[PDB]
Amino acid sequence: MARGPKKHLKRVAAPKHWMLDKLTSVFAPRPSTGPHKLRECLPLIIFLRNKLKYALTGDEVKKICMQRFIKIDGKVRADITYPAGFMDVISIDKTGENFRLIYDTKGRFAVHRITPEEAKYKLCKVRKIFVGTKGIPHLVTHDARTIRYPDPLIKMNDTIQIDLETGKITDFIKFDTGNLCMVTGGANLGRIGVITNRERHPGSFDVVHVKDANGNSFATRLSNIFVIGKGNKPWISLPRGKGIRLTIAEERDKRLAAKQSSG
Amino acid sequence: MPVARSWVCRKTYVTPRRPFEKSRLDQELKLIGEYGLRNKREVWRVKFTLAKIRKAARELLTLDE
Amino acid sequence: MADIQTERAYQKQPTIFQNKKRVLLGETGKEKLPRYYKNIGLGFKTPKEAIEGTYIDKKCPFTGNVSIRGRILSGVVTKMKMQRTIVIRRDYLHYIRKYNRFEKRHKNMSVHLSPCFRDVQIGDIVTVGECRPLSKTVRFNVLKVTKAAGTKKQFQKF
Amino acid sequence: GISRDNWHKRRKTGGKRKPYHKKRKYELGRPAANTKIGPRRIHTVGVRGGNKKYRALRLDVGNFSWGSECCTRKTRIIDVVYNASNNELVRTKTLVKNCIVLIDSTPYRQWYESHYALPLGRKKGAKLTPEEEEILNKKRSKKIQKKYDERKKNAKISSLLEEQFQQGKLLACIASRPGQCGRADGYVLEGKELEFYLRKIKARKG
RNA sequence: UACCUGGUUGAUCCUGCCAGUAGCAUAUGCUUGUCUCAAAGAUUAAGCCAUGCAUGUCUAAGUACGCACGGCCGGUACAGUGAAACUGCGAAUGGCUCAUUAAAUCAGUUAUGGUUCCUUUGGUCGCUACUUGGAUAACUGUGGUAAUUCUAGAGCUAAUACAUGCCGACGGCGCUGACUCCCUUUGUGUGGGAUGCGUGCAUUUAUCAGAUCAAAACCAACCCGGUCGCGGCUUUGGUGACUCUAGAUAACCUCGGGCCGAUCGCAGCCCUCCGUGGCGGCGACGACCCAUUCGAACGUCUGCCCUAUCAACUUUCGAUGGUAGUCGCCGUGCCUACCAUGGUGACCACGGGUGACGGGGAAUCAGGGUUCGAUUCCGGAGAGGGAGCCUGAGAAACGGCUACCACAUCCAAGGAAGGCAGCAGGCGCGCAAAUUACCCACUC
RNA sequence: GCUGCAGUUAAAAAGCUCGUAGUUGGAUCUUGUGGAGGGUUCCCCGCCCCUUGCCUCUCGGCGCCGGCCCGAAGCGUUUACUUUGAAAAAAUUAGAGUGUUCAAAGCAGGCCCGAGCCGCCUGGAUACCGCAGCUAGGAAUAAUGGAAUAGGACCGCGGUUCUAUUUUGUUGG
RNA sequence: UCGCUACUACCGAUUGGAUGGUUUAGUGAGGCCCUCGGAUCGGCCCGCCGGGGUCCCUGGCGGAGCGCUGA
């Protein structure tokens, strides 16, 4: 029977992009309730144990966090299954290093090291606009942040930049044609291109057409488009491969020609 | 009960349909004697890997160049 | 028309009020009731008979308390012995894949039809959209009526 | 116990259905409030999600609006006179939404007479002159009579209410749900609603 | 590897079936050296169960007068380790089985503009008071019954348990209008103004406003550039679509029965300042309301095995629909009153059967197919059979409670106690299925 | 036995005829020269007669010295079909890489001096995922439709009734 | 056709037997809701004594009404 909410996760039921092995276990870490959806996050334990390899077991992760070393968006978090997600920054002040979560072009989180002056801000997509009591205007972002008194030009689907020490808005990018974006869901996940057309339907879903640096074309539902730069230039540094999504025949040929992986 | 095991496995040979075909019996024994094998199953393994190779090449030859 | 209060309780539109002040009209008069009506969206148009009419119907899309959302469908008017509701027929082909051949099937829907449509007949074509549950078996409401792509009511001069 | 499910009853075709599961708690129902006229008795119940709901068993007083005059005040409830749904509800005096009731006219009369500087409910001079004339006439420097044309040129009430005010009672309609809110509360009957219910009241018994 | 062979006659050519040949999964017989994997009381009986275990929990930070153990001596609230008990949280997840169930469950697809939501994360948190009240548990002391995780009478004492309730920061702004001053006795244009009443967000009801467009001509009175007839204009946000969001007015308000802190732990400070007025650094715990996250619930479209030795069926004993209401978290014949006479079927309704839980899937396979799916992932249902209900954000819960029905244990015959389709183990059944072992090291 | 069986005599065509549902249903309504890729004429532009078939606005950028032009929109009589986008758990199946000592499996692993490298490189692909719903091109085949008790259209006129309440300097008439 | 030995099914007296589902009429445990009930337990009003003070606070003994008022 199901008389209330569930609190376990089977390892074959867990999100594919975490890359968990088949044979160590029956269970996987259930992500803690928080700012990002269960299908769309990376639990902090998988980042420290499986990606960075600073710990060999979940107990070695627990005694890294309880020493207060780990910051997410500039706040110290002691919870080992906290749901980190897209555009967040992780700082490890004791080893002296900083990371940002961004998609690899195969649709998984890359490790991406950043300089300490770039670790001071993040980019946020707008979800909602509304007016409260005494006529005060409010804004809501993709990561549950609520802001009072936004600039009256900031509309739906726009991108805003915030400083992490104060949480207030600094600058913004309008959703319109010719701006650079990244794709955050569907089959096109982890690709980058410029917006070239928006096609709209009254009821059901709008569709956006996007163009690559190499001149390829692709499309997706409007809910999967995140804007990252005015015109041709991004407001964030980008990982190896820059979102170009080369095919399996091109990938074979570079792997043979470059002789990488200790050939 | 749930368990951390896995259950994937497969067979690596097939038995012939005619058990006592005279033309088949001495052909298989000549391959055993020339290559120094233990039994008939050790020949039926090699016929099965060749059949799977030819089954794949016959599919790819249907598609456009 | 000339009377509408045929029920045991008084019938009126919500959100409309009549002032009992400045009531003088002389030897003649004008309508004591203004009319409430709305736009449905989705490129539909509100009938003249809803704006110029005097009927009360709470389940009406144009002049009552319903929201049009989800699927839009069409079918053929086939029975109308109930009051403010009708039955429509939907016909389709089902594919059976062992054979390479089709099978004819049908379903019926009960739908709500307001006044403002008043010349519908059996064999007319009707367009409908989803609502909240309106009664036990009713989930859809009439948005448009037509007799295009078919023969006339009476002779060809209609 | 009592339940409000859809699965106990038959489908469009006339065919039966068999039970899918035992009764669930979210399918629940409870007995009716049956609110009477009498001094306040209210009880409270815990509801799904841990919220509270108020159930009125007896009420003597309510809040009513005279929408024509923009006046609303706390008022005594006297009697019930019509119910569109069932005659046993007026025979046993039970209070529900869209019930028709009699209320005390006094707080509306006192607002009107002090606002317009005119009498309303009065029969003859013996109920005008001997007391409370000093509500109507006082010293009013440059506000005495002509400046009250802002009042006097729009003071006339409908004939159907001036006949009610002389008897000390008005007809009103209940707008709240008393078995759900704990309150009995509504508006004064006027115009064609008043003509409709006066015909229905007279045609039933009179 | 897209395949056949024996058998009707005195002999021949056919039809047609029987028998052979290969795989797969249940039982069973004979036989057995090494090494890596690993199914296993589903089929019959969702039949019955001796014994043991399977759910508990404390930090610098709710309550420490346990001589229980202890220090250099002292309570300056009071040290320090701390059994017990009170308070808080969890026990609604996990694990087991497949009886019921054929438009039901379930799958793909869509919707809440028809609802609720512990916790996390972000907003919000100023219409006797230098600190109030009484009363229980652990403990001490005296008992009752054949008997249980049974409990009674007496003496003490706590709070983040239970119950009260200020101070500070009212200085709001609208409505009344004694009087008073100026052009014009009134009306009508003014500026002051004694004095009363209401005045945060939630709650119930009623009312108001929501601005934009095309073209002139007269008249009362004037904005304004100017003076005794002409130029020129202005005001929350949002959806395909709201009786949306925000705003204004008149009242209500829940009280014993909505919010706005009588709480706890670390380092100390700055001064009309000698221990005073405060202001303040880091927190911990708590609570009303938005938005999130995890969901749950209800609804849309299309999809099902055999059967006519099942052809008509449903219908105030609610069947289909309308109007008003009750009940409910909310839409709705969900239920009640009044009214209408409807709704489904040869394109198979209604009725009956199923060694029927649905799906991802599995065996065999030239191409097309046939058969299977109790079973590790996902959804549903149920804890001997039916029914009712407490607590809580969440249950109609069974390692919770109350009763009837079927079994059955102890007794001093008055009474008391019970639920292995959890893990091992036993009886019964049958062709048919393993140890009453070790550990929280790994995964959670 | 759909692909794919059989019914004179081996098993098997109702004694005969009518007929509602079901399945099936005759012919017909716009083409060749020129250029690119490729050939020695036909698939993309523009044309005998129409090439998105029409059209003229207005909120809204372009081209140039106001006016005239070229991308949305009304939309092309309605559907099936076909080709293309989007969106659909993982494991299983197919399939790429990789000397578990080989293999069935697994998701790993590979370079370099000595230990002074306080290390470096690299994988965890990809396809399939009926039907039903969503979407943009094609127009053969098969459904479906318009004026015979004449209506399409012109910057065309006329009587009469309803009526938003704009443009005027506003509040009122 | 009649006769001998095996094996399977049919008809049927018997008011047969066991198990299960529908359903008329009568009875009805136990919970929840509503209208009543009131065992027992407190406070605030009238003496005396004591601590503080310009007869009241407030601890205690104690009796009449056991008023009024709460659980």
Number of H helices, E strands in chain C: 1, 5
Gap from C92 CA to chain A (nearest CA, Å): 24
Q: CA angle at residue C85 from C84 to C87, to 5 degrees?
A: 155
With DSSP H G I counted as helix, E B as strand and the rest as coil, what are the percentages for chain A, rounded to 5?
15, 30, 55
Q: How far apart are the first and last CA of chain A?
A: 56
The chain A residue lying nearest B3, using CA atoms, is A26
The reply to whether B10 has its C-beta less than 7 Å from any atom of strand F is yes
Distances (CA, A) of A46 to A62, A68, A263, B4: 12, 18, 30, 19
**Resolution of the solved structure (Å):** 2.9
| Inter-CA distances, A253 with A32, A107, A247, A262, C116, Å | 42, 22, 10, 16, 70
CA distances from A157 to A101, A207, A235 (A): 21, 14, 17
Tell me if C73 sits within 8 A of C90, measured CB to CB: yes
Task: Say if residues D78 and D201 touch (Cβ distance below 8 Å).
Answer: no
Query: Which two three-digit tokens encode residue B32?
Result: 């055993």
Q: How many CB atoms lie within 10 A of CB B21?
A: 10
Degrees to nearest 5, angle at CA A236 with A235 and A239: 145
A109 and A101 Cβ atoms separated by less than 8 Å? yes
> What is the rounded CA–CA span in Å between residue C138 and residue C108?
11
Q: Which domains does chain C have, with CATH numbers?
A: 2-152 (2.40.50.1000)
- Residue D71 has, within 13 A of its CA and on its CB side, a CA count of 16
Start-end of H helices in D70-131: 88-91, 106-116
Report in angstroms the alpha-carbon separations of D21 from B39, D1, D28, D29: 62, 15, 15, 18
Amino acid code (one letter) for C133: P
Q: What is the CA radius of gyration of chain D?
A: 24
Straight-line distance from CA B9 to C1' E69, in Å?
65
Calpha distance A200→C72 (Å, rounded): 18
**Chain C contact for D159 (CB, 8 A cutoff):** no
- For residue B32, the surrounding DSSP H or E stretch is helix B22-35
- Residue A53 φ/ψ region, left for φ over 0, alpha for ψ in the -120 to 50 degree band, beta for the rest: left
Length of chain D: 206
The answer to whether A36 touches A143, Cβ cutoff 8 Å, is yes
D146-163 in b/e burial notation, b at 16+ Cβ within 10 A?
A: eeeeeeeeeeebeeebee
| Cα–Cα distance for residue pair C63/C141, rounded to 1 Å | 13
Residues D165/D121, Cβ–Cβ less than 8 Å: yes
Chain A nearest-CA residue for B2: A26
The structure tokens listed for A244 are 């170009």
In angstroms, how far is E115 C1' from A86 CA?
32
Residue A112 CB partners (closer than 8 Å, separation 6+): A99, A100, A101, A102, A237, A239
Q: Residue A137 phi/psi, 5° resolution?
A: -80, 140
As given in the structure block, the two tokens for residue A23 are 């044979």
Residue C150 in contact with partner chain A when CB distance is under 8 A:
no
Residue D103 is encoded by which pair of tokens?
């209320």
Q: How far apart are alpha carbons C145 and C128 in whole angstroms?
A: 9
Question: For residues D95 and D178, what is the distance between their CA atoms, to the nearest angstrom?
Answer: 8
Pairwise CA distance, residues D30 & D44, whole Å: 13
DSSP state of C152: P
CA dist C144 and D8 (Å) reads: 36
> Any atom of strand F under 7 A from CB of B6?
yes
Cα separation, D5 vs D23, whole angstroms: 9
By three-state DSSP, how is residue C56 classified? coil
| Structure-token pair, residue A46 | 């998988």
Q: For the stretch A165-182, what's the b/e string if a residue is b when 16 or more beta carbons lie within 10 angstroms of its beta carbon? A: eeeebeebbebeeebbbb
Both structure tokens of A19: 């890359």
What is the count of residue pairs from A and C with beta carbons less than 8 Å apart? Answer: 5
DSSP single-letter state for residue C141? E
Residue A154's CB is within 10 A of a number of other CB atoms, namely: 17
Residues 55-94 of C with CB under 7 A from strand F: 94
Backbone angles phi, psi at A84, to 5 degrees: -65, 150
| Single-letter code of the amino acid located at A98 | N
* CA A237/CA A235 separation, integer angstroms: 7
Whose CA is closest to C77, among C69, C85, C65?
Answer: C85
- The verdict on C43 touching A (C-beta cutoff 8 Å) is yes
Estimate the crossing angle of helix B22-35 against helix B41-60, to 10 degrees: 100
Nearest C-alpha neighbor of C64 from the set C72, C76, C56, C73: C56
**D132: Cβ–Cβ under 8 A, 6 or more apart, which residues?**
none
Contact A203 C42 (CB under 8 A): yes
Its sign, for the CA torsion D51, A144, A39, A217, is positive
Using the 8-state DSSP alphabet, how is residue D171 labeled? Answer: E
**Residue B44 φ/ψ, nearest 5 degrees:** -65, -25
- On whether the CB atoms of residues D50 and D35 are closer than 8 A, the answer is no
Whole-number Cα distances in Å, D25 to A4, D1, D20, D21, D167 = 13, 9, 15, 12, 52
Question: Is C72 in contact with C128 (CB distance < 8 Å)?
Answer: yes
Collect all residues of chain B within an 8 Å Cβ-Cβ radius of residue A25: 4
Quick check: helix, strand or coil at residue D77? strand
Report the run of H or E that residue A45 belongs to, with start and end: helix A44-46
What's the Cα-to-Cα distance from C47 to each of C50, C68, C117, C131, D123, rounded to whole Å? 6, 16, 8, 19, 54
Nearest to C57 by CA among C110, C2, C117: C117
Across all strands, nucleotide nearest A209 (CA–C1'): F85
State the chains in contact with C (3 or more Cβ–Cβ pairs under 8 Å): A, D
Q: Which two tokens stand for residue A124?
A: 């946020």
The rounded distance, in Å, linking the Cα atoms of D2 and C151 is 55
- Rg of chain B over Cα atoms, rounded to whole angstroms, equals 18
CB proximity D11 to C under 8 Å: no
Q: How far apart are CA A244 and CA A256, in angstroms?
A: 19
At A125, give phi and psi (nearest 5°).
-85, 135
Q: Which residue of B has its CA nearest to A21?
A: B4
Taking the CA of residue D161 and the C1' sugar atom of nucleotide E211, their distance in angstroms comes to 37
> B48: number of CA atoms within 13 Å, CB side?
13
Report the distance separating Cα C149 and Cα A160, nearest Å: 53
Report the first-to-last Cα separation within chain B, whole angstroms.
51
Q: Which element (helix H / strand E) includes C145?
A: strand C140-146
Chains A and B touch (3+ CB pairs under 8 A): yes
CA of D105 to C1' of G25 (A): 58
Pairing of strands D52-59, D36-37: parallel
Residues A40/A34, Cβ–Cβ less than 8 Å:
no
Length of chain B in residues, anyone?
65
For chain D, how far is it from start to end, CA to CA, in angstroms?
44
Chains that touch D (3 or more CB pairs under 8 A): C
Q: Which of A146, C17, A250 is nearest to D192 (CA)?
A: C17
Q: Which residue has the tokens 């979940």?
A: A58
Q: Locate tokens 């016929």: which residue?
A: B47
DSSP letter assigned to residue A168: -
The single-letter DSSP state of residue A247 is -
Residue whose entry in the numeric block shows the structure tokens 């082909």:
C93
Of A10, A23, A25, the CB nearest to B6: A23
All domains in chain A, ordered by first residue: 2-117 (3.10.290.10), 122-172 (2.40.50.740), 175-245 (2.30.30.30)
**Gap between the Cα atoms of A24 and A9, Å rounded:** 15
3-state secondary structure of A118: helix
d(C-alpha A187, C-alpha C24), whole Å: 71
